[PDB]
């Protein structure tokens, strides 16, 4: 709507991307993750935090 280049704003965080539900990880689990490099390749949603 605003004409931004590469807008970081979504009307709502998508439930599905490419036909699969987007993975959601709590901030506490993501903090303790040691396989973070494999996770970021696919993409995820961070929640349980402000």
């Amino acid at each position: 709507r605003f004409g931004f280049r590469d807008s970081p704003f979504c009307t709502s965080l998508p439930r599905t991307i490419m036909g699969n539900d987007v993975r959601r990880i709590s901030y506490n689990v993501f903090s303790m993750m040691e396989d973070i490099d494999d996770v970021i390749s696919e993409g995820f949603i961070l929640y349980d935090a402000y």
């Binding site: 539900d21 959601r24 709590s26 506490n28 689990v29």
Partner: protein
Amino acid sequence: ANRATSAFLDNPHPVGVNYVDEGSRQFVAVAELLASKLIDSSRESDESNSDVPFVQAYSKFADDNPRHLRVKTGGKMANALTNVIRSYYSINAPAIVPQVEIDRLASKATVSGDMYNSYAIFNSVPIVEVLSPARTTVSIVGSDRADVTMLNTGAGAANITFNFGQIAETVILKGSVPFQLARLNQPMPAARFTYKLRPLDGPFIVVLPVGNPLVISATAATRIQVPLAFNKALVESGFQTAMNDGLFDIQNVNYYSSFDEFIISQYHAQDGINRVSTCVILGLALQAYDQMRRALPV
């Protein structure tokens, strides 16, 4: 000769084999704990004249703030809880919930997920077989209280065999009139109203005199290991709610009047101890379903 069997013991359908691991057990326990807080927070909100306690409970359960113009559905946790309930009932259910979704929902609270910390008493009476000779009619009615009506038309007294299975712990027999009952190869005692029996002690023979019909009322108690959070009143409400919502409407399945009949029938099936563990997790999920849906009707 004639054979009479309880209606609810016939043809138990296979149960699901999914979402029975440790990670999935914790999710069901997490849903039950968070659903209980939803009910309590709604009561607190009504008393305190503030919606703040309910907003926190809904946000934890649904990962989103309540909105006036959006229907309160419970979020993704409600969908996952609904889908696992479908899978537990039958092996033909889809079972489409991802493992990543189940694991993330079990991290919302810390619970053991142990389903053997306590026990519950089930009252369904299992009459596997009643064997009656010729010129006698035997009818079995009821599950929680089984009434067996027998008529002797022939010339002399008849012997009737009762089989209560090998799973039930105790069985109490009460008659309309005093009657004689004894085990196989045992002398008959004097007629009395009430008999207490151990089902593992072989078949029982009942003497049926000619004349007025004799009616026997049977009550049984069976102990099945259940988690500490198990509540039979809430499980029963959830079982009725799930049937009305269509969660159990799958092809080639059997329907029961109560969760009491469901768990006992699966126990008595061949290799029925496999199914009893899955049925307990289903009961806990129905306990979460009842509390969540009562707080958030759809």
